[PDB]
Amino acid sequence: KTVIKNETGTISISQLNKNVWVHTELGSFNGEAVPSNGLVLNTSKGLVLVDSSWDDKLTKELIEMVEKKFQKRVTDVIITHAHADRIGGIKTLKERGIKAHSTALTAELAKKNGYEEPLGDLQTVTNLKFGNMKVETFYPGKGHTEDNIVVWLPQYNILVGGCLVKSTSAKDLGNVADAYVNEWSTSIENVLKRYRNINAVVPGHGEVGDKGLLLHTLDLLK
Ligand SMILES: O=C(O)/C(S)=C/c1c(F)ccc(F)c1F
Ligand SMILES: [Zn+2]
Ligand SMILES: [Zn+2]
């Protein structure tokens, strides 16, 4: 697939189909680069992102790269939980007039932790349409965090698992300070029950996979 990088290599976009790309950014933490993934949706009414990035500098540069390439503005972002990889660029979004969608719980947690607040407009199931691009958001229950949601593209059967879903390279659950490891299995089961025919699964970190990433996450939770 087509892969396009910034000069530093810290931001990359990879094409999944004509209108759907994965964005990946490296956040540097004590000398260790840590990548994280979101989506870029190229719609007839603008660009929509699933997730920002670790901080405002990276978010600014991601927006600028995609607006230049796709020749449209970023209009909306969906924030999938209130950790820095997802929400760290919220100040940039607000000051540019980019709408930052989230559940109410994600917005409360953002505020509790000193971030600017997203809209708190998403429910347990929300169906959005941007141009011709359909987007469903789903709260499956607690897992990696109490608030994590997934994003589904029904025209492509693409699931953005976010940090609820571990990549094949993840050999443990990672940081579980804010996680609910009992509920996590049930939450993944709720995803597997809702979306029974999945073409790709985008984890929060690591390589794109398929429903096997869900099953891998269930095994890590044993
Ligand atoms: O494993 C992950 O998906 C994530 S988001 C871990 C994590 C976290 F628990 C707290 C803060 C943060 F900045 C993080 F990156
Ligand atoms: Zn997280
Ligand atoms: Zn994460």
PDB file of C-alpha atoms and ligand atoms in Angstrom:
ATOM      1  CA  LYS A   1       0.000   0.000   0.000  1.00  0.00           C
ATOM      2  CA  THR A   2       1.025   3.611  -0.472  1.00  0.00           C
ATOM      3  CA  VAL A   3       3.004   5.055   2.495  1.00  0.00           C
ATOM      4  CA  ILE A   4       3.922   8.735   2.754  1.00  0.00           C
ATOM      5  CA  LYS A   5       6.117  10.197   5.470  1.00  0.00           C
ATOM      6  CA  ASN A   6       7.169  13.559   6.797  1.00  0.00           C
ATOM      7  CA  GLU A   7      10.776  14.669   6.596  1.00  0.00           C
ATOM      8  CA  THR A   8      11.665  13.356  10.046  1.00  0.00           C
ATOM      9  CA  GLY A   9       9.812  10.042   9.625  1.00  0.00           C
ATOM     10  CA  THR A  10       7.924  10.749  12.863  1.00  0.00           C
ATOM     11  CA  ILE A  11       4.575  10.942  10.936  1.00  0.00           C
ATOM     12  CA  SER A  12       3.466   8.458   8.319  1.00  0.00           C
ATOM     13  CA  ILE A  13       0.177   7.862   6.485  1.00  0.00           C
ATOM     14  CA  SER A  14      -0.609   4.468   4.918  1.00  0.00           C
ATOM     15  CA  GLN A  15      -3.455   3.912   2.485  1.00  0.00           C
ATOM     16  CA  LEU A  16      -6.065   1.232   3.324  1.00  0.00           C
ATOM     17  CA  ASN A  17      -8.405   2.188   0.438  1.00  0.00           C
ATOM     18  CA  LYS A  18      -9.358   5.129  -1.805  1.00  0.00           C
ATOM     19  CA  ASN A  19     -10.602   7.255   1.106  1.00  0.00           C
ATOM     20  CA  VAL A  20      -9.166   5.664   4.272  1.00  0.00           C
ATOM     21  CA  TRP A  21      -5.592   6.009   5.522  1.00  0.00           C
ATOM     22  CA  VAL A  22      -3.931   5.109   8.818  1.00  0.00           C
ATOM     23  CA  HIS A  23      -1.902   7.887  10.427  1.00  0.00           C
ATOM     24  CA  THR A  24       1.010   6.821  12.636  1.00  0.00           C
ATOM     25  CA  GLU A  25       3.149   9.123  14.867  1.00  0.00           C
ATOM     26  CA  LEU A  26       6.203   8.469  16.973  1.00  0.00           C
ATOM     27  CA  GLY A  27       6.156   9.904  20.490  1.00  0.00           C
ATOM     28  CA  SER A  28       9.575   9.951  22.134  1.00  0.00           C
ATOM     29  CA  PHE A  29       9.548   8.966  25.815  1.00  0.00           C
ATOM     30  CA  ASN A  30      12.864   8.703  27.679  1.00  0.00           C
ATOM     31  CA  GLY A  31      14.746   7.826  24.502  1.00  0.00           C
ATOM     32  CA  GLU A  32      12.213   5.191  23.368  1.00  0.00           C
ATOM     33  CA  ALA A  33      10.093   5.905  20.295  1.00  0.00           C
ATOM     34  CA  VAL A  34       6.490   4.772  20.797  1.00  0.00           C
ATOM     35  CA  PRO A  35       4.245   4.753  17.707  1.00  0.00           C
ATOM     36  CA  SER A  36       0.533   5.298  17.795  1.00  0.00           C
ATOM     37  CA  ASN A  37      -2.173   4.984  15.123  1.00  0.00           C
ATOM     38  CA  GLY A  38      -5.332   6.783  14.087  1.00  0.00           C
ATOM     39  CA  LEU A  39      -7.323   7.173  10.841  1.00  0.00           C
ATOM     40  CA  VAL A  40      -7.620   9.829   8.151  1.00  0.00           C
ATOM     41  CA  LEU A  41     -10.967   9.790   6.271  1.00  0.00           C
ATOM     42  CA  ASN A  42     -11.019  11.660   2.983  1.00  0.00           C
ATOM     43  CA  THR A  43     -14.606  12.798   2.468  1.00  0.00           C
ATOM     44  CA  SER A  44     -16.420  15.060   0.097  1.00  0.00           C
ATOM     45  CA  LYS A  45     -16.886  17.621   2.896  1.00  0.00           C
ATOM     46  CA  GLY A  46     -13.421  17.609   4.400  1.00  0.00           C
ATOM     47  CA  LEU A  47     -11.016  15.391   6.224  1.00  0.00           C
ATOM     48  CA  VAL A  48     -12.070  13.590   9.376  1.00  0.00           C
ATOM     49  CA  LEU A  49      -9.553  12.061  11.753  1.00  0.00           C
ATOM     50  CA  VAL A  50      -9.956   9.239  14.225  1.00  0.00           C
ATOM     51  CA  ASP A  51      -7.663  10.376  17.048  1.00  0.00           C
ATOM     52  CA  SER A  52      -5.119  13.150  17.254  1.00  0.00           C
ATOM     53  CA  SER A  53      -1.580  12.541  18.461  1.00  0.00           C
ATOM     54  CA  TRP A  54       0.693  12.630  21.502  1.00  0.00           C
ATOM     55  CA  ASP A  55       1.024  16.377  21.607  1.00  0.00           C
ATOM     56  CA  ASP A  56       0.178  19.613  19.840  1.00  0.00           C
ATOM     57  CA  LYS A  57       3.366  19.768  17.749  1.00  0.00           C
ATOM     58  CA  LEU A  58       2.669  16.399  16.180  1.00  0.00           C
ATOM     59  CA  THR A  59      -1.033  17.169  15.729  1.00  0.00           C
ATOM     60  CA  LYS A  60      -0.276  20.434  13.936  1.00  0.00           C
ATOM     61  CA  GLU A  61       2.136  18.694  11.594  1.00  0.00           C
ATOM     62  CA  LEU A  62      -0.302  15.839  10.895  1.00  0.00           C
ATOM     63  CA  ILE A  63      -3.098  18.256  10.022  1.00  0.00           C
ATOM     64  CA  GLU A  64      -0.819  20.281   7.790  1.00  0.00           C
ATOM     65  CA  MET A  65       0.415  17.202   5.950  1.00  0.00           C
ATOM     66  CA  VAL A  66      -3.049  15.883   5.187  1.00  0.00           C
ATOM     67  CA  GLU A  67      -4.627  19.224   4.265  1.00  0.00           C
ATOM     68  CA  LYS A  68      -1.819  19.819   1.776  1.00  0.00           C
ATOM     69  CA  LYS A  69      -1.989  16.313   0.307  1.00  0.00           C
ATOM     70  CA  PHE A  70      -5.770  15.933   0.066  1.00  0.00           C
ATOM     71  CA  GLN A  71      -6.467  19.620  -0.683  1.00  0.00           C
ATOM     72  CA  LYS A  72      -9.271  19.889   1.885  1.00  0.00           C
ATOM     73  CA  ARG A  73      -9.525  21.076   5.494  1.00  0.00           C
ATOM     74  CA  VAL A  74      -9.681  18.836   8.564  1.00  0.00           C
ATOM     75  CA  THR A  75     -13.154  19.462   9.955  1.00  0.00           C
ATOM     76  CA  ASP A  76     -13.677  16.851  12.713  1.00  0.00           C
ATOM     77  CA  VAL A  77     -11.771  14.447  14.934  1.00  0.00           C
ATOM     78  CA  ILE A  78     -13.143  11.527  16.936  1.00  0.00           C
ATOM     79  CA  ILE A  79     -11.311  11.055  20.287  1.00  0.00           C
ATOM     80  CA  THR A  80     -11.448   7.431  21.436  1.00  0.00           C
ATOM     81  CA  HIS A  81     -10.221   7.813  25.056  1.00  0.00           C
ATOM     82  CA  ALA A  82      -8.629  10.416  27.323  1.00  0.00           C
ATOM     83  CA  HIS A  83      -4.919   9.384  27.213  1.00  0.00           C
ATOM     84  CA  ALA A  84      -2.220  11.581  25.582  1.00  0.00           C
ATOM     85  CA  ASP A  85      -1.815   9.447  22.407  1.00  0.00           C
ATOM     86  CA  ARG A  86      -5.495  10.060  21.565  1.00  0.00           C
ATOM     87  CA  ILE A  87      -6.146  13.561  22.979  1.00  0.00           C
ATOM     88  CA  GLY A  88      -2.798  15.290  23.272  1.00  0.00           C
ATOM     89  CA  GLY A  89      -3.538  17.625  20.386  1.00  0.00           C
ATOM     90  CA  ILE A  90      -6.907  18.866  21.618  1.00  0.00           C
ATOM     91  CA  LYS A  91      -5.702  22.435  22.146  1.00  0.00           C
ATOM     92  CA  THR A  92      -4.711  22.598  18.476  1.00  0.00           C
ATOM     93  CA  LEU A  93      -8.066  21.248  17.394  1.00  0.00           C
ATOM     94  CA  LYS A  94     -10.055  23.741  19.418  1.00  0.00           C
ATOM     95  CA  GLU A  95      -8.065  26.780  18.412  1.00  0.00           C
ATOM     96  CA  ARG A  96      -8.354  25.872  14.721  1.00  0.00           C
ATOM     97  CA  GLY A  97     -12.111  25.318  14.892  1.00  0.00           C
ATOM     98  CA  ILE A  98     -11.873  21.564  14.337  1.00  0.00           C
ATOM     99  CA  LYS A  99     -14.720  19.759  16.086  1.00  0.00           C
ATOM    100  CA  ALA A 100     -13.498  17.217  18.646  1.00  0.00           C
ATOM    101  CA  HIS A 101     -16.142  14.509  19.210  1.00  0.00           C
ATOM    102  CA  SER A 102     -16.060  12.210  22.285  1.00  0.00           C
ATOM    103  CA  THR A 103     -18.354  10.525  24.763  1.00  0.00           C
ATOM    104  CA  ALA A 104     -19.317  12.494  27.873  1.00  0.00           C
ATOM    105  CA  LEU A 105     -17.196  10.195  29.993  1.00  0.00           C
ATOM    106  CA  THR A 106     -14.124  10.842  27.806  1.00  0.00           C
ATOM    107  CA  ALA A 107     -14.742  14.598  28.127  1.00  0.00           C
ATOM    108  CA  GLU A 108     -15.031  14.391  31.947  1.00  0.00           C
ATOM    109  CA  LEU A 109     -11.844  12.404  32.177  1.00  0.00           C
ATOM    110  CA  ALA A 110     -10.066  14.822  29.881  1.00  0.00           C
ATOM    111  CA  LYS A 111     -11.067  17.677  32.208  1.00  0.00           C
ATOM    112  CA  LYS A 112     -10.164  15.748  35.287  1.00  0.00           C
ATOM    113  CA  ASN A 113      -6.694  15.309  33.861  1.00  0.00           C
ATOM    114  CA  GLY A 114      -6.154  18.877  32.789  1.00  0.00           C
ATOM    115  CA  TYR A 115      -6.841  18.640  29.044  1.00  0.00           C
ATOM    116  CA  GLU A 116      -9.193  20.886  27.149  1.00  0.00           C
ATOM    117  CA  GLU A 117     -12.589  19.207  26.731  1.00  0.00           C
ATOM    118  CA  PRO A 118     -13.936  17.560  23.601  1.00  0.00           C
ATOM    119  CA  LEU A 119     -17.645  17.838  22.868  1.00  0.00           C
ATOM    120  CA  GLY A 120     -19.061  14.932  24.835  1.00  0.00           C
ATOM    121  CA  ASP A 121     -21.612  14.377  22.081  1.00  0.00           C
ATOM    122  CA  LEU A 122     -21.185  10.653  21.384  1.00  0.00           C
ATOM    123  CA  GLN A 123     -23.596   8.123  22.954  1.00  0.00           C
ATOM    124  CA  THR A 124     -23.144   4.360  23.387  1.00  0.00           C
ATOM    125  CA  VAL A 125     -23.908   4.014  19.635  1.00  0.00           C
ATOM    126  CA  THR A 126     -23.603   7.096  17.433  1.00  0.00           C
ATOM    127  CA  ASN A 127     -23.987   7.177  13.658  1.00  0.00           C
ATOM    128  CA  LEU A 128     -22.316  10.083  11.870  1.00  0.00           C
ATOM    129  CA  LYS A 129     -22.057  10.940   8.191  1.00  0.00           C
ATOM    130  CA  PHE A 130     -19.377  13.203   6.740  1.00  0.00           C
ATOM    131  CA  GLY A 131     -20.114  13.798   3.057  1.00  0.00           C
ATOM    132  CA  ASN A 132     -20.751  10.258   1.872  1.00  0.00           C
ATOM    133  CA  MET A 133     -18.549   8.643   4.556  1.00  0.00           C
ATOM    134  CA  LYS A 134     -20.475   6.779   7.204  1.00  0.00           C
ATOM    135  CA  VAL A 135     -18.940   6.431  10.696  1.00  0.00           C
ATOM    136  CA  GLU A 136     -20.339   4.551  13.679  1.00  0.00           C
ATOM    137  CA  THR A 137     -18.911   4.964  17.173  1.00  0.00           C
ATOM    138  CA  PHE A 138     -19.507   2.279  19.777  1.00  0.00           C
ATOM    139  CA  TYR A 139     -18.759   2.131  23.528  1.00  0.00           C
ATOM    140  CA  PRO A 140     -18.360  -1.611  24.262  1.00  0.00           C
ATOM    141  CA  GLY A 141     -17.579  -1.267  27.951  1.00  0.00           C
ATOM    142  CA  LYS A 142     -14.484  -0.827  30.081  1.00  0.00           C
ATOM    143  CA  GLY A 143     -11.115  -2.276  29.026  1.00  0.00           C
ATOM    144  CA  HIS A 144      -7.890  -0.503  28.371  1.00  0.00           C
ATOM    145  CA  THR A 145      -9.595   2.452  30.035  1.00  0.00           C
ATOM    146  CA  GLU A 146     -13.102   2.997  31.448  1.00  0.00           C
ATOM    147  CA  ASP A 147     -14.043   5.170  28.521  1.00  0.00           C
ATOM    148  CA  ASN A 148     -12.525   3.520  25.416  1.00  0.00           C
ATOM    149  CA  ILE A 149     -14.676   3.462  22.276  1.00  0.00           C
ATOM    150  CA  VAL A 150     -14.231   1.809  18.880  1.00  0.00           C
ATOM    151  CA  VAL A 151     -15.019   3.258  15.474  1.00  0.00           C
ATOM    152  CA  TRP A 152     -16.615   1.301  12.641  1.00  0.00           C
ATOM    153  CA  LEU A 153     -16.712   2.182   8.916  1.00  0.00           C
ATOM    154  CA  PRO A 154     -19.696   0.169   7.593  1.00  0.00           C
ATOM    155  CA  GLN A 155     -18.983   0.867   3.938  1.00  0.00           C
ATOM    156  CA  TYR A 156     -15.605  -0.892   4.325  1.00  0.00           C
ATOM    157  CA  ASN A 157     -16.090  -3.163   7.387  1.00  0.00           C
ATOM    158  CA  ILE A 158     -13.037  -1.488   8.931  1.00  0.00           C
ATOM    159  CA  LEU A 159     -12.811  -1.422  12.748  1.00  0.00           C
ATOM    160  CA  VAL A 160     -10.647   1.083  14.569  1.00  0.00           C
ATOM    161  CA  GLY A 161     -10.036  -0.830  17.726  1.00  0.00           C
ATOM    162  CA  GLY A 162      -7.899   1.825  19.323  1.00  0.00           C
ATOM    163  CA  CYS A 163      -6.088   0.911  22.486  1.00  0.00           C
ATOM    164  CA  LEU A 164      -8.731  -1.650  23.491  1.00  0.00           C
ATOM    165  CA  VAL A 165      -7.154  -3.881  20.824  1.00  0.00           C
ATOM    166  CA  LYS A 166      -3.548  -5.085  21.006  1.00  0.00           C
ATOM    167  CA  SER A 167      -1.422  -5.695  17.949  1.00  0.00           C
ATOM    168  CA  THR A 168       0.223  -9.100  17.266  1.00  0.00           C
ATOM    169  CA  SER A 169       3.565  -7.637  18.378  1.00  0.00           C
ATOM    170  CA  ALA A 170       2.170  -6.771  21.825  1.00  0.00           C
ATOM    171  CA  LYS A 171       3.108  -9.585  24.171  1.00  0.00           C
ATOM    172  CA  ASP A 172       1.374  -8.129  27.233  1.00  0.00           C
ATOM    173  CA  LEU A 173      -1.374  -5.623  28.043  1.00  0.00           C
ATOM    174  CA  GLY A 174       0.918  -2.652  28.497  1.00  0.00           C
ATOM    175  CA  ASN A 175       0.033   0.065  30.971  1.00  0.00           C
ATOM    176  CA  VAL A 176      -2.911  -1.172  33.008  1.00  0.00           C
ATOM    177  CA  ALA A 177      -3.026   1.600  35.597  1.00  0.00           C
ATOM    178  CA  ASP A 178      -6.320   2.837  34.177  1.00  0.00           C
ATOM    179  CA  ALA A 179      -7.527  -0.545  32.842  1.00  0.00           C
ATOM    180  CA  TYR A 180     -10.289  -2.932  33.934  1.00  0.00           C
ATOM    181  CA  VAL A 181      -8.854  -6.334  33.125  1.00  0.00           C
ATOM    182  CA  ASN A 182     -11.904  -8.324  34.029  1.00  0.00           C
ATOM    183  CA  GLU A 183     -14.306  -6.271  32.021  1.00  0.00           C
ATOM    184  CA  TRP A 184     -11.906  -6.009  29.076  1.00  0.00           C
ATOM    185  CA  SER A 185     -12.720  -9.512  27.827  1.00  0.00           C
ATOM    186  CA  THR A 186     -16.463  -8.833  27.915  1.00  0.00           C
ATOM    187  CA  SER A 187     -15.929  -5.531  26.117  1.00  0.00           C
ATOM    188  CA  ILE A 188     -14.017  -7.295  23.305  1.00  0.00           C
ATOM    189  CA  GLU A 189     -16.743  -9.932  23.164  1.00  0.00           C
ATOM    190  CA  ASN A 190     -19.249  -7.093  22.706  1.00  0.00           C
ATOM    191  CA  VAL A 191     -17.238  -5.839  19.732  1.00  0.00           C
ATOM    192  CA  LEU A 192     -17.060  -9.328  18.214  1.00  0.00           C
ATOM    193  CA  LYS A 193     -20.863  -9.719  18.686  1.00  0.00           C
ATOM    194  CA  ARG A 194     -21.646  -6.359  17.055  1.00  0.00           C
ATOM    195  CA  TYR A 195     -19.299  -6.641  14.067  1.00  0.00           C
ATOM    196  CA  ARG A 196     -19.346 -10.224  12.854  1.00  0.00           C
ATOM    197  CA  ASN A 197     -17.668  -9.691   9.434  1.00  0.00           C
ATOM    198  CA  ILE A 198     -14.527  -7.510   9.734  1.00  0.00           C
ATOM    199  CA  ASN A 199     -12.089  -6.726   6.904  1.00  0.00           C
ATOM    200  CA  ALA A 200      -9.361  -4.885   8.860  1.00  0.00           C
ATOM    201  CA  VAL A 201      -8.752  -3.990  12.488  1.00  0.00           C
ATOM    202  CA  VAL A 202      -6.586  -0.982  13.302  1.00  0.00           C
ATOM    203  CA  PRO A 203      -5.060  -1.321  16.812  1.00  0.00           C
ATOM    204  CA  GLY A 204      -4.055   1.756  18.816  1.00  0.00           C
ATOM    205  CA  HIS A 205      -0.388   0.778  18.444  1.00  0.00           C
ATOM    206  CA  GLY A 206       1.245  -1.583  15.924  1.00  0.00           C
ATOM    207  CA  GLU A 207       0.354  -3.189  12.618  1.00  0.00           C
ATOM    208  CA  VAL A 208      -3.084  -3.376  11.082  1.00  0.00           C
ATOM    209  CA  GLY A 209      -4.582  -6.856  11.337  1.00  0.00           C
ATOM    210  CA  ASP A 210      -7.978  -8.559  11.289  1.00  0.00           C
ATOM    211  CA  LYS A 211     -10.350 -10.111  13.843  1.00  0.00           C
ATOM    212  CA  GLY A 212      -7.372 -12.149  15.016  1.00  0.00           C
ATOM    213  CA  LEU A 213      -6.211  -9.059  16.943  1.00  0.00           C
ATOM    214  CA  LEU A 214      -9.398  -9.260  19.008  1.00  0.00           C
ATOM    215  CA  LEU A 215      -8.670 -12.926  19.736  1.00  0.00           C
ATOM    216  CA  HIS A 216      -5.088 -12.068  20.569  1.00  0.00           C
ATOM    217  CA  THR A 217      -6.255  -9.478  23.079  1.00  0.00           C
ATOM    218  CA  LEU A 218      -8.540 -12.083  24.690  1.00  0.00           C
ATOM    219  CA  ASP A 219      -5.545 -14.413  25.072  1.00  0.00           C
ATOM    220  CA  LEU A 220      -3.418 -11.638  26.669  1.00  0.00           C
ATOM    221  CA  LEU A 221      -6.173 -11.180  29.241  1.00  0.00           C
ATOM    222  CA  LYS A 222      -5.981 -14.818  30.452  1.00  0.00           C
TER     223      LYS A 222
HETATM  224  O1  LIG B   1      -1.186   1.105  25.991  1.00  0.00           O
HETATM  225  C1  LIG B   1      -1.712   2.090  25.501  1.00  0.00           C
HETATM  226  O2  LIG B   1      -2.485   1.993  24.492  1.00  0.00           O
HETATM  227  C2  LIG B   1      -1.651   3.432  26.122  1.00  0.00           C
HETATM  228  S1  LIG B   1      -2.539   4.818  25.358  1.00  0.00           S
HETATM  229  C3  LIG B   1      -0.950   3.598  27.268  1.00  0.00           C
HETATM  230  C4  LIG B   1      -0.852   4.888  27.974  1.00  0.00           C
HETATM  231  C5  LIG B   1      -1.335   5.021  29.278  1.00  0.00           C
HETATM  232  F1  LIG B   1      -1.863   3.913  29.861  1.00  0.00           F
HETATM  233  C6  LIG B   1      -1.335   6.204  29.980  1.00  0.00           C
HETATM  234  C7  LIG B   1      -0.856   7.345  29.356  1.00  0.00           C
HETATM  235  C8  LIG B   1      -0.372   7.250  28.071  1.00  0.00           C
HETATM  236  F2  LIG B   1       0.121   8.348  27.444  1.00  0.00           F
HETATM  237  C9  LIG B   1      -0.360   6.056  27.395  1.00  0.00           C
HETATM  238  F3  LIG B   1       0.231   6.004  26.185  1.00  0.00           F
HETATM  239 ZN    ZN B   2      -4.598   4.693  26.476  1.00  0.00          ZN
HETATM  240 ZN    ZN B   3      -2.777   3.928  23.257  1.00  0.00          ZN
END
